[PDB]
Design an enzyme around this catalytic site. Structure first.
Site, mmCIF file in Angstrom:
data_model
loop_
_atom_site.group_PDB
_atom_site.id
_atom_site.type_symbol
_atom_site.label_atom_id
_atom_site.label_comp_id
_atom_site.label_asym_id
_atom_site.label_seq_id
_atom_site.Cartn_x
_atom_site.Cartn_y
_atom_site.Cartn_z
ATOM 1 C CB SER A 131 -1.348 22.758 19.171
ATOM 2 O OG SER A 131 -0.371 23.185 18.249
ATOM 3 C CD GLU A 151 20.512 42.803 28.127
ATOM 4 O OE1 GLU A 151 21.408 43.378 28.777
ATOM 5 O OE2 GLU A 151 20.707 41.733 27.516
ATOM 6 C CG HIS A 192 4.379 17.400 13.086
ATOM 7 N ND1 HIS A 192 4.438 16.100 12.638
ATOM 8 C CD2 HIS A 192 3.532 18.048 12.254
ATOM 9 C CE1 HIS A 192 3.673 15.971 11.570
ATOM 10 N NE2 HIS A 192 3.110 17.139 11.317
ATOM 11 C CE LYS A 240 -6.913 32.860 16.423
ATOM 12 N NZ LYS A 240 -7.588 31.751 17.135
ATOM 13 C CG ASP A 241 -0.407 32.069 12.789
ATOM 14 O OD1 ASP A 241 -1.269 32.047 13.684
ATOM 15 O OD2 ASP A 241 0.264 31.065 12.484
HETATM 16 C C1 HEC Z 1 25.324 38.694 12.743
HETATM 17 C C2 HEC Z 1 24.235 38.047 13.144
HETATM 18 C C3 HEC Z 1 23.402 38.402 14.388
HETATM 19 C C4 HEC Z 1 22.437 37.610 14.782
HETATM 20 C C5 HEC Z 1 22.089 36.300 14.060
HETATM 21 C C6 HEC Z 1 21.821 38.178 15.954
HETATM 22 N N1 HEC Z 1 22.458 39.360 16.248
HETATM 23 FE FE1 HEC Z 1 22.032 40.367 17.996
HETATM 24 N N2 HEC Z 1 23.559 41.658 17.295
HETATM 25 C C7 HEC Z 1 24.376 41.557 16.196
HETATM 26 C C8 HEC Z 1 25.358 42.608 16.194
HETATM 27 C C9 HEC Z 1 26.440 42.804 15.123
HETATM 28 C C10 HEC Z 1 25.141 43.338 17.273
HETATM 29 C C11 HEC Z 1 25.933 44.576 17.735
HETATM 30 C C12 HEC Z 1 25.539 45.823 16.962
HETATM 31 C C13 HEC Z 1 24.372 46.491 17.619
HETATM 32 O O1 HEC Z 1 24.157 46.285 18.831
HETATM 33 O O2 HEC Z 1 23.657 47.244 16.923
HETATM 34 C C14 HEC Z 1 24.020 42.757 17.977
HETATM 35 C C15 HEC Z 1 23.499 43.232 19.139
HETATM 36 C C16 HEC Z 1 22.487 42.663 19.852
HETATM 37 C C17 HEC Z 1 21.909 43.224 21.039
HETATM 38 C C18 HEC Z 1 22.311 44.554 21.693
HETATM 39 C C19 HEC Z 1 21.639 45.665 20.906
HETATM 40 C C20 HEC Z 1 22.065 46.993 21.447
HETATM 41 O O3 HEC Z 1 22.451 47.865 20.632
HETATM 42 O O4 HEC Z 1 22.024 47.169 22.690
HETATM 43 C C21 HEC Z 1 20.968 42.404 21.461
HETATM 44 C C22 HEC Z 1 20.095 42.626 22.705
HETATM 45 C C23 HEC Z 1 20.915 41.286 20.555
HETATM 46 N N3 HEC Z 1 21.860 41.474 19.579
HETATM 47 C C24 HEC Z 1 20.076 40.214 20.639
HETATM 48 C C25 HEC Z 1 19.962 39.245 19.679
HETATM 49 C C26 HEC Z 1 19.043 38.138 19.710
HETATM 50 C C27 HEC Z 1 18.052 37.956 20.881
HETATM 51 C C28 HEC Z 1 19.234 37.428 18.586
HETATM 52 C C29 HEC Z 1 18.586 36.137 18.040
HETATM 53 C C30 HEC Z 1 17.955 35.213 18.770
HETATM 54 C C31 HEC Z 1 20.291 38.066 17.849
HETATM 55 N N4 HEC Z 1 20.709 39.170 18.537
HETATM 56 C C32 HEC Z 1 20.782 37.627 16.651
HETATM 57 C C33 HEC Z 1 24.277 40.600 15.245
HETATM 58 C C34 HEC Z 1 23.439 39.529 15.295
HETATM 59 C C1 HEC Z 2 10.182 26.889 27.437
HETATM 60 C C2 HEC Z 2 9.020 27.131 26.872
HETATM 61 C C3 HEC Z 2 9.057 27.349 25.448
HETATM 62 C C4 HEC Z 2 9.947 28.127 24.807
HETATM 63 C C5 HEC Z 2 11.017 28.910 25.461
HETATM 64 C C6 HEC Z 2 9.666 28.072 23.465
HETATM 65 N N1 HEC Z 2 8.619 27.253 23.285
HETATM 66 FE FE1 HEC Z 2 7.480 26.924 21.602
HETATM 67 N N2 HEC Z 2 6.248 25.919 22.524
HETATM 68 C C7 HEC Z 2 6.294 25.616 23.809
HETATM 69 C C8 HEC Z 2 5.162 24.811 24.167
HETATM 70 C C9 HEC Z 2 4.900 24.285 25.536
HETATM 71 C C10 HEC Z 2 4.449 24.649 23.059
HETATM 72 C C11 HEC Z 2 3.186 23.870 22.921
HETATM 73 C C12 HEC Z 2 1.985 24.761 23.117
HETATM 74 C C13 HEC Z 2 0.944 23.961 23.817
HETATM 75 O O1 HEC Z 2 0.963 23.792 25.049
HETATM 76 O O2 HEC Z 2 0.052 23.456 23.137
HETATM 77 C C14 HEC Z 2 5.160 25.363 22.014
HETATM 78 C C15 HEC Z 2 4.697 25.415 20.721
HETATM 79 C C16 HEC Z 2 5.373 26.111 19.768
HETATM 80 C C17 HEC Z 2 4.929 26.317 18.462
HETATM 81 C C18 HEC Z 2 3.666 25.864 17.827
HETATM 82 C C19 HEC Z 2 2.701 27.036 17.803
HETATM 83 C C20 HEC Z 2 2.277 27.272 19.214
HETATM 84 O O3 HEC Z 2 1.936 28.399 19.614
HETATM 85 O O4 HEC Z 2 2.252 26.319 20.002
HETATM 86 C C21 HEC Z 2 5.856 27.019 17.816
HETATM 87 C C22 HEC Z 2 5.813 27.477 16.397
HETATM 88 C C23 HEC Z 2 6.884 27.260 18.700
HETATM 89 N N3 HEC Z 2 6.587 26.695 19.887
HETATM 90 C C24 HEC Z 2 7.993 27.965 18.365
HETATM 91 C C25 HEC Z 2 8.870 28.376 19.336
HETATM 92 C C26 HEC Z 2 9.932 29.195 19.001
HETATM 93 C C27 HEC Z 2 10.229 29.684 17.633
HETATM 94 C C28 HEC Z 2 10.603 29.439 20.126
HETATM 95 C C29 HEC Z 2 11.798 30.248 20.250
HETATM 96 C C30 HEC Z 2 12.577 30.324 19.192
HETATM 97 C C31 HEC Z 2 9.911 28.719 21.184
HETATM 98 N N4 HEC Z 2 8.876 28.112 20.625
HETATM 99 C C32 HEC Z 2 10.341 28.744 22.491
HETATM 100 C C33 HEC Z 2 7.215 25.950 24.773
HETATM 101 C C34 HEC Z 2 8.226 26.797 24.488
HETATM 102 C C1 LIG Z 3 1.424 24.260 15.709
HETATM 103 O O1 LIG Z 3 1.108 24.834 14.454
HETATM 104 C C2 LIG Z 3 2.158 25.493 13.881
HETATM 105 C C3 LIG Z 3 3.097 24.810 13.112
HETATM 106 O O2 LIG Z 3 3.018 23.459 12.960
HETATM 107 C C4 LIG Z 3 4.136 25.495 12.504
HETATM 108 C C5 LIG Z 3 5.137 24.712 11.703
HETATM 109 C C6 LIG Z 3 4.259 26.864 12.647
HETATM 110 C C7 LIG Z 3 5.355 27.668 11.978
HETATM 111 C C8 LIG Z 3 6.704 27.802 12.651
HETATM 112 C C9 LIG Z 3 7.614 28.620 12.147
HETATM 113 C C10 LIG Z 3 7.336 29.440 10.913
HETATM 114 C C11 LIG Z 3 8.978 28.769 12.777
HETATM 115 C C12 LIG Z 3 10.032 28.406 11.722
HETATM 116 C C13 LIG Z 3 11.362 29.082 11.974
HETATM 117 C C14 LIG Z 3 12.486 28.655 11.431
HETATM 118 C C15 LIG Z 3 12.518 27.451 10.525
HETATM 119 C C16 LIG Z 3 13.778 29.376 11.722
HETATM 120 C C17 LIG Z 3 14.601 29.571 10.443
HETATM 121 C C18 LIG Z 3 15.056 31.009 10.390
HETATM 122 C C19 LIG Z 3 15.853 31.506 9.469
HETATM 123 C C20 LIG Z 3 16.209 32.967 9.556
HETATM 124 C C21 LIG Z 3 16.404 30.671 8.340
HETATM 125 C C22 LIG Z 3 17.853 31.065 8.024
HETATM 126 C C23 LIG Z 3 17.964 31.777 6.691
HETATM 127 C C24 LIG Z 3 18.884 32.691 6.459
HETATM 128 C C25 LIG Z 3 19.886 33.066 7.518
HETATM 129 C C26 LIG Z 3 18.951 33.372 5.113
HETATM 130 C C27 LIG Z 3 19.282 34.857 5.277
HETATM 131 C C28 LIG Z 3 20.356 35.243 4.291
HETATM 132 C C29 LIG Z 3 20.499 36.462 3.818
HETATM 133 C C30 LIG Z 3 19.568 37.568 4.252
HETATM 134 C C31 LIG Z 3 21.618 36.718 2.834
HETATM 135 C C32 LIG Z 3 21.719 38.183 2.401
HETATM 136 C C33 LIG Z 3 22.909 38.369 1.490
HETATM 137 C C34 LIG Z 3 22.785 38.720 0.231
HETATM 138 C C35 LIG Z 3 24.014 38.892 -0.619
HETATM 139 C C36 LIG Z 3 21.437 38.957 -0.398
HETATM 140 C C37 LIG Z 3 3.306 27.537 13.379
HETATM 141 O O3 LIG Z 3 3.426 28.875 13.498
HETATM 142 C C38 LIG Z 3 2.251 26.873 13.998
HETATM 143 O O4 LIG Z 3 1.338 27.572 14.735
HETATM 144 C C39 LIG Z 3 0.268 27.985 13.878
#
Ligand code: HEC
Ligand code: HEC
Ligand SMILES: COc1c(O)c(C)c(C/C=C(\C)CC/C=C(\C)CC/C=C(/C)CC/C=C(\C)CC/C=C(\C)CCC=C(C)C)c(O)c1OC
Ligand SMILES: CCCCCCCCCCC(=O)OC[C@H](COP(=O)(O)OC[C@H](O)COP(=O)(O)OC[C@@H](COC(=O)CC)OC(=O)CCC)OC(=O)CCCCCCCC
Ligand SMILES: CCCCCCCCCCCCCCCC(=O)OC[C@H](COP(=O)([O-])OCC[N+](C)(C)C)OC(=O)CCCCCCCCCCCCCCC
Ligand code: HEC
Ligand code: HEC
Ligand code: HEC
Ligand code: HEC
Ligand SMILES: COc1c(O)c(C)c(C/C=C(\C)CC/C=C(\C)CC/C=C(\C)CC/C=C(\C)CC/C=C(/C)CCC=C(C)C)c(O)c1OC
Ligand SMILES: CCCCCCCCCCCCCCC(=O)O[C@H](COC(=O)CCCCCCCCCCCC)COP(=O)(O)O
Ligand SMILES: CCCCCCCCCCCCCCCCCC(=O)O[C@H](COC(=O)CCCCCC)COP(=O)(O)OCCN
Ligand SMILES: CCCCCCCCCCCCCCCCCC(=O)O[C@H](COC(=O)CCCCCC)COP(=O)(O)OCCN
Ligand SMILES: CCCCCCCCCCCCCC(=O)O[C@H](COC(=O)CCCCCCCCCCC)COP(=O)(O)O
Lengths: 72, 385, 248, 54, 385, 248
Positions: E206, E272, E202, E228-229
């Protein structure tokens, strides 16, 4: 001291150090028997050998081995 | 410009903990915020390093806690820090909220800050309750049972809500497993709410113990309040080290070392020490639904606080009657805790009802009336006619 | 409740391990294990105490090994799937006298004898409660108390009626070191042994507490000095104010 | 004090002095506190009991 | 001013997803960032609701996963979404990093953004590996064994590091429990790194697919790139719904439904599908220490990228040879994955070595030489002398 | 590896449950359970399949109850702690023929018969592999293969040498519905039954997949319309440029 506490809390606990050693009996295994055990999370082959198997072991030429080593 | 000002990441570190303009008259009561941040970091780090050895089955929870306290190297340090630090976390949070009520930090323009504080307080009570149920002792099991039956009081829907919470028909293996998952989860929501709390603070700066502006004489954060917070950090670690190493099981309840038995009810079911005023508030109402509503209203009545403080000066520093009734309120809150720790016996029921009434009367009747009288008294003391 | 349901308050006995510096009496722990094995272990499990924790605490290596090899545990089955037993080793746990809960309730008139691994940490009063429980049985209950048959009286139990028998009599065990083994001596020894069983970290906990309290007190005083130092430019700051010329 | 600023002038040698001081302090403080904690409890430890048992 | 601009909380929502000035020429490749955010939310929510039923003991892990797939209502939806969504998370992340390499988004002033992206990539590989070991199948156990023995290659220290990682002497109950705790923990670090990533984005906005400035014709975020997203969100959910509901076990390896047996080694141990290029890079080096160093250097060589792109125009849009060698690189990365999926057999060893060399030669030799030649060719094409 | 270590590639049999709309053949699952119980269940456990999952899928309520009451499970012990048995109910699991691993390896010449709850999902090829494994034994191995004694040949197993016997012969079971029970019929039935045992969600998974793919395809086309709609002010935007007066 804080880093020691929080890192040494992730080492091997007391009860997994308790089962680090096995104490197998020499008098309980017969001669022509192989014993396969799970020790330290690993397989272990145990054999009571005869003196002719000893003579067979220590008299093979080292050039028939890609990693030569004596029996003792 | 400097690198701490021109970099994107270090500009936040700058504008929050280096060059933040603080009022130069704030005493040690403006240090509980940094102390709560340190104690939250303590809770999270001990929670991770202790949850690497925890198995959350109902048949393996208590045995895994004892495996931590016996077989894990320095595991007694981890569990004792964790439980006693949760106790200190609520004690420092109670002192922080009392600093908020006393010096008038809830008033405008800091209503958003106060509301995010109340949200953090509710989430922290939820986290402590879930983690106390994760032990699965006697008190853990029966406290989970009583609180979820309190959720069954909700009309026409509540029984299905409770069968949803339990994941079954009583407090069983899915209940303890989902309490461990939620208990791992909710502290990160608390960390996000803390960041939102710091934003709502930073848009207007801290208050001061006089209740006047502090825009005239500001001193930076760095070295001044850094070393003042370092003083109270070392005092807090000293008292925590005392209650961890020399007397660890004082604040806890000894019934929690009995394993969880669904058949044997205890002689006295009591939560851990800080939820006792709220338990007394709920136990003082002779109805289940009104009891649950009154227990949640005892926290939402902190949200109705900035709209009832009609005092035109900020804070209770220079006011007599408001300061006196504030300490009436504080010792009433302590008396609520001590009523809740006792049995349902004469005369503790009548005293619990009177103490709940004085709690709600302080938040709804005493503060506006005493603030109005204090305003008129300040006016006619110095204006002659 | 009355004082009868709450139970009588156990007094303050001056143990040799109270105080922030005193450790356990390990000879008393050894004698407490002997009284445990010859009296309690007929009816109380000790399920959370492994054999290896006694090595170097109350017994030597060979003593714990030759006490553990008297018992039989479940081995892995043989090459035909038949279940077999094995003598104990250092890594096993101290076995209970009863195979399950129902055998315990059958052999003890319905009452379940609680596991004594944490019993001094799971009762209010603790050491004083266990000692007063053991040495607190009257010769006859006070006049007007109708005991249910099969139960016994001592005032320290909550309710008065306990299902334990008075099992500490004069010289029922012999000590290895020749200590006179009266009832109070054996009760003090088993209460010290159960304090060890609930808190095996107690010695190291108190010495690390000594180190931590010394270092943090020194840090707290040093930090008070540095706060009074770096604020010295601001505490002593002075302001004078001559009011400006009003023409501007 | 005196004119010695070879300890306090340069931050490299100053933080090296602090690290060497803590490196000595860990060992010395641990040994001294173990000796005191065993001297205060003479007769209660397993060392004394094992020396008492013939 | 407006309430979305004057409020403290809604100003971030405004300045990030409502009034953010985006270049009006960006195509659908600038949508993978929003798609990765959605897929991270999917992974976290399914992880919580599936970790309420998971017991992390080594004797109860695989049985609890099958308890999720059989007894839990809609649990097959949760596990299949979770595993196949992790596969789509790496596929969208690979496409996002390829968008970064192609259009030159790594160049100045966006080096901080690229470095935080590489940190997110390393943390995501770590999270996927830990969660794949949490299944404790055959591939899970033996992959954990091979990766930690690779950590034992470190000289003079490594064996104690590995006994620290294992928490024992082989992959056992403490290993699986700490992998579950770390695997629950590291996605919140990924969320924090994503917020830092958005900040570093930011501060300059971009890029655009032309490689010129976009300060002239900006259009807002709201309704334009929101819808678009939304288009690509619905396409992503459509393809994820296909690979979850109609063919769930395609991307996985069938050996992972055998329970974890430390005695039986598999016929072919393969990670994997997405870690296979890195596994091929490591397997191509005939040394353990140099193999581990080369595997980590294959990610740090993305950090050395903005200092070698000597092209004076941003991005490969209007350059011929750089575009050609970019697609050479992409299909080389696919060929690394397919070499790694095979056995250690003639001629796959020699092809793995050549493919690793072409990987590092693209990042270190091909890009600066081709960019220099393209600069001189652009100059002498239009300048006459 | 050669093709011998990798095993021969199982071909593409046209099952009645391939395709994105076809479900299981539940009559074939019923007959597959019958062939399981009368052939496989002497030597293969099915440890992850409860009895209640067959109710309403391949058998009725009373059929599953009267098949589960033929087996004995561990009851809670009586009032003297003696271990006792009970007949099965709907909430128990299908028991294996072997009490532990060592009895299995003793009764099957060292080789452990794998549990068949997930065996069609834990092999590459799946249904085709299990069917070709069962119906793939030659009458005699190809010339030049020295089998280890006690092992058998079929080319579909990786390595060629399997420790299973050919256990599907003509009409060894009788079907309830009168279907001619040849070897291929029984193999097709047990492979369908094992597909049910590994994937009991298969029917509901495909119908919820139908609902989700329909709703998301409609949402994707609607969102394409709304994106082309709200960008119509920006796609059609035009720019003309008359260069300004250079005096300023
Ligand atoms: C509790 C929070 C939780 C988060 C947050 C989470 N996972 Fe997992 N994940 C699990 C659990 C529990 C398992 C094992 C159960 C299963 O594999 O179904 C798992 C399993 C996996 C597996 C193996 C799946 C399979 O069955 O082979 C992969 C790959 C994975 N996670 C990737 C990710 C990635 C990538 C992210 C986020 C960037 C992520 N997980 C976030 C809970 C989580
Ligand atoms: C290592 C490379 C790389 C990784 C990995 C990466 N980003 Fe980016 N991301 C970028 C670059 C570079 C840009 C700027 C795009 C450009 O060149 O204008 C960007 C831009 C973005 C943007 C703005 C929208 C867009 O398309 O540019 C978002 C949202 C974003 N990243 C989210 C993520 C998220 C969420 C992850 C993983 C959780 C991630 N990025 C991982 C390199 C990365
Ligand atoms: C360059 O222009 C942009 C731009 O500026 C931005 C900001 C974005 C937008 C970026 C995003 C939306 C990414 C943001 C991602 C995060 C902030 C990650 C946060 C992720 C989370 C999952 C937050 C954590 C929240 C929880 C873990 C709550 C879950 C809890 C639960 C489910 C409890 C359940 C239990 C009971 C009892 C109900 C763009 O896509 C983009 O391109 C158009
Ligand atoms: C219970 C578990 C909680 C764990 C939290 C650990 C931290 C405890 C915090 C307690 C606290 O913050 O109270 C602050 C209160 C108000 O402070 P003030 O600014 O008005 O006084 C200015 C000072 O003279 C400046 O003096 P100076 O700043 O130079 O040094 C202050 C003092 C540090 O002590 C403390 O921080 C509190 C103990 O250094 C010393 O000289 C100590 C000598 C041994 O300090 C006081 O002066 C006491 C007033 C009564 C408060 C009683 C509290 C009962 C609840
Ligand atoms: C988290 C807790 C980790 C604690 C680790 C402590 C490591 C040592 C810190 C103490 C130290 O050595 O500080 C020295 C430096 C400078 O400290 P200073 O004395 O204020 O600076 C003056 C420099 N002169 C003029 C003397 C040359 O100070 C620094 O370099 C600042 C380090 C601060 C670490 C936090
Ligand atoms: C894994 C991360 C984790 C975090 C983060 C965490 N805890 Fe806990 N907590 C645990 C575990 C595991 C237990 C159960 C083991 C135990 O009680 O020792 C627990 C137990 C507790 C207990 C009961 C202690 C006892 O033994 O009676 C309390 C109280 C508690 N947590 C409060 C908190 C509070 C307050 C916070 C933060 C605001 C917090 N926890 C954060 C893991 C965590
Ligand atoms: C319910 C009230 C309330 C709770 C609970 C609360 N806060 Fe505060 N916090 C405040 C108020 C009000 C202020 C500002 C008061 C003032 O400056 O006059 C404040 C200020 C702060 C400050 C600035 C320093 C200071 O003392 O003013 C920090 C840091 C802080 N809070 C962190 C936290 C943390 C961390 C938590 C727990 C996670 C927390 N707060 C819980 C109300 C609360
Ligand atoms: C006669 C069998 C028997 C013997 C021998 C015995 N106990 Fe008990 N003990 C019991 C029973 C039964 C209970 C359960 C009492 C109850 O539940 O009311 C019990 C309970 C206890 C309790 C807990 C009492 C309470 O109210 O919580 C303690 C402490 C105790 N025993 C100590 C000992 C000690 C120490 C020994 C060894 C000296 C011992 N017991 C030997 C039968 C016995
Ligand atoms: C003769 C005893 C025996 C009988 C009867 C038997 N099995 Fe097996 N089966 C085995 C053994 C042993 C193995 C594993 C042998 C090996 O791994 O080499 C096995 C393995 C299998 C395998 C997988 C083999 C592999 O390589 O993965 C399947 C599938 C299988 N059996 C299905 C069945 C079915 C279906 C039936 C009943 C129709 C059945 N078996 C009856 C002994 C038997
Ligand atoms: C008003 O002026 C201010 C002010 O602006 C601020 C910011 C603060 C400071 C307040 C805080 C810092 C509180 C905020 C607290 C948080 C944001 C909590 C953050 C903590 C976490 C996110 C958890 C910590 C996580 C880790 C350290 C991850 C590493 C942990 C582990 C277990 C990895 C170990 C694994 C291996 C394999 C080694 C003040 O104190 C203050 O008053 C002076
Ligand atoms: C996220 C966790 C929040 C916890 C709240 C902690 C609030 C207080 C933090 C104190 C940081 C001190 C840094 C001061 C500094 O760098 O000044 C530096 C140098 O000062 C020092 O060297 C201080 C000596 C070393 C003190 C080390 C204390 C470590 C113990 C911390 C325990 C809590 C983590 C700048 O000082 P100067 O500008 O006056 O020259
Ligand atoms: C819990 C946090 C929640 C979110 C709050 C965000 C606040 C984060 C506080 C982090 C403070 C410590 C960060 C120090 C990093 C400063 C280094 C730096 O900015 O150098 C940057 C480069 O940064 C990097 O490459 C790596 C940054 C990774 C940071 C991961 C922690 C130099 O870039 P520069 O600003 O000079 O711009 C010139 C453009 N070529
Ligand atoms: C690490 C960062 C994690 C993410 C944090 C940053 C992103 C936060 C986005 C939050 C979006 C949702 C917040 C909208 C709420 C706006 C309401 C509001 O600001 O009114 C606030 C009061 O808010 C509250 O009482 C509690 C808000 C707690 C929010 C809990 C989510 C009043 O604000 P204001 O002072 O401008 O109003 C003056 C009246 N004319
Ligand atoms: C919390 C993030 C979850 C995002 C899931 C996206 C992945 C696509 C597969 C979804 C399948 C799971 C749902 C399902 O099985 O429903 C099935 C129906 O299919 C659908 O309608 C899915 C359409 C998805 C639309 C997404 C809307 C966005 C909602 C954001 C959260 C409020 C089953 O329906 P039924 O249980 O019979 O009511």
């Amino acid at each position: 001291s804080t880093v020691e506490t929080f890192i040494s809390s992730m080492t091997a606990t007391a009860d997994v150090l308790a089962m680090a050693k096995v104490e197998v009996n020499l008098a309980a295994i017969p001669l022509g028997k192989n014993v396969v055990v799970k020790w330290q999370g690993k397989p272990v082959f145990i054999r009571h050998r005869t003196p002719h198997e000893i003579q067979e072991a220590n008299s093979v030429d080292m050039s028939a081995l890609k990693d030569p080593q004596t029996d003792a | 410009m400097a690198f701490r000002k021109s970099n994107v990441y270090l500009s936040l570190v700058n504008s929050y903990i280096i060059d933040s303009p603080q009022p130069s008259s704030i005493n040690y009561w403006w240090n509980m915020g940094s102390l709560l941040g340190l104690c939250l970091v303590i809770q999270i780090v001990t929670g991770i390093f202790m949850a690497m050895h925890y198995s959350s089955n109902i048949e393996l929870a208590f045995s895994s806690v004892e495996h931590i306290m016996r077989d894990v190297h320095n595991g007694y340090i981890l569990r004792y820090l964790h439980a006693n630090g949760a106790s200190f976390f609520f004690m420092v949070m109670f002192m922080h909220m009392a600093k908020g009520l006393y010096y008038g930090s809830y008033r405008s323009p800091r209503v958003t800050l106060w509301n995010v504080g109340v949200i953090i307080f509710i989430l922290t009570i939820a986290t402590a309750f879930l983690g106390y149920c994760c032990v699965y002792g006697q008190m853990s099991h029966w406290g989970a049972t009583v609180i979820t039956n309190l959720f069954s009081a909700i009309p026409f829907v509540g029984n299905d809500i409770v069968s949803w919470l339990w994941g079954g028909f009583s407090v069983s293996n899915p209940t303890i497993q989902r309490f461990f998952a939620l208990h791992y989860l909710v502290p990160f929501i608390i960390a996000a709410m803390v960041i939102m709390h710091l934003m709502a603070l930073h848009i207007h700066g801290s208050s001061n113990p006089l209740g006047i502006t502090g825009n005239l004489d500001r001193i930076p954060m760095h070295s001044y309040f850094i070393f003042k917070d370092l003083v109270t950090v070392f005092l807090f670690m000293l008292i925590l080290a005392l209650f961890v190493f020399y007397s660890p099981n004082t604040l806890g309840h000894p019934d929690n070392y009995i394993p969880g038995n669904p058949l044997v009810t205890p002689a006295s079911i009591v939560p851990e020490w800080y939820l006792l005023p709220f338990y007394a508030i709920l136990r003082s109402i002779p109805d289940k639904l009104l009891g649950v509503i009154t227990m949640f209203a005892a926290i939402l009545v902190l949200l109705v606080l900035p709209f009832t403080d009609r005092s035109v000066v900020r804070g209770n520093t220079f006011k007599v009657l408001s300061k006196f009734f504030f300490f009436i309120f504080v010792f009433n809150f302590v008396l609520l805790g001590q009523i809740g720790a006792c049995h349902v016996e004469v005369p503790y029921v009548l005293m619990g009802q009177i103490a709940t009434f004085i709690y709600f009367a302080y938040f709804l009747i005493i503060v506006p009336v005493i603030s109005t009288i204090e305003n008129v008294l300040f006016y006619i003391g110095r204006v002659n006619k | 409740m009355t004082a009868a349901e709450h139970g009588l308050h156990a007094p303050a006995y001056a143990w040799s391990h109270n105080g922030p510096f005193e450790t356990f009496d390990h000879a008393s722990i050894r004698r407490g294990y002997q009284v445990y094995r010859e009296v309690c272990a007929a009816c109380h499990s000790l399920d959370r105490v492994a054999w290896r924790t006694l090595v170097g605490v109350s017994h030597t290596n060979e003593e714990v090994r030759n006490m553990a090899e008297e018992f039989e545990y479940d081995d892995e089955p043989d090459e035909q799937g038949n279940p077999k037993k094995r003598p104990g080793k250092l890594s096993d746990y101290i076995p209970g006298p009863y195979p399950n809960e129902q055998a315990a309730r059958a052999a003890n008139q319905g009452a379940l004898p609680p596991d004594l691994s944490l019993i001094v940490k799971a009762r209010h009063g603790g050491c004083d409660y266990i000692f007063s429980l053991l040495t607190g049985y009257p010769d006859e209950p006070p006049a007007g108390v109708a005991l249910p048959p099969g139960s016994n009286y001592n005032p320290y139990f909550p309710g008065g009626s306990i299902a334990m028998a008075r099992v500490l009599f004069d010289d029922m065990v012999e000590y290895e070191d020749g200590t006179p083994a009266t009832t109070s001596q054996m009760a003090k020894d088993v209460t010290t042994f159960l304090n060890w069983c609930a808190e095996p970290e107690h010695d190291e906990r108190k010495r690390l507490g000594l180190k931590t309290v010394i270092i943090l007190s020194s840090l707290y005083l040093l930090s008070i000095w540095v706060k009074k130092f770096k604020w010295a430019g601001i505490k002593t700051r002075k302001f004078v104010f001559n009011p400006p010329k009003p023409r501007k | 004090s005196s004119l010695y600023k070879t300890f306090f002038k340069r931050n490299a040698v100053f933080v090296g002095t602090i690290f060497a001081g803590a490196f000595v302090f860990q060992t010395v403080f641990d040994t001294a506190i173990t000796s005191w904690y065993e001297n205060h409890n003479k007769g209660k430890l397993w060392k004394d009991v094992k020396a008492r048992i013939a």
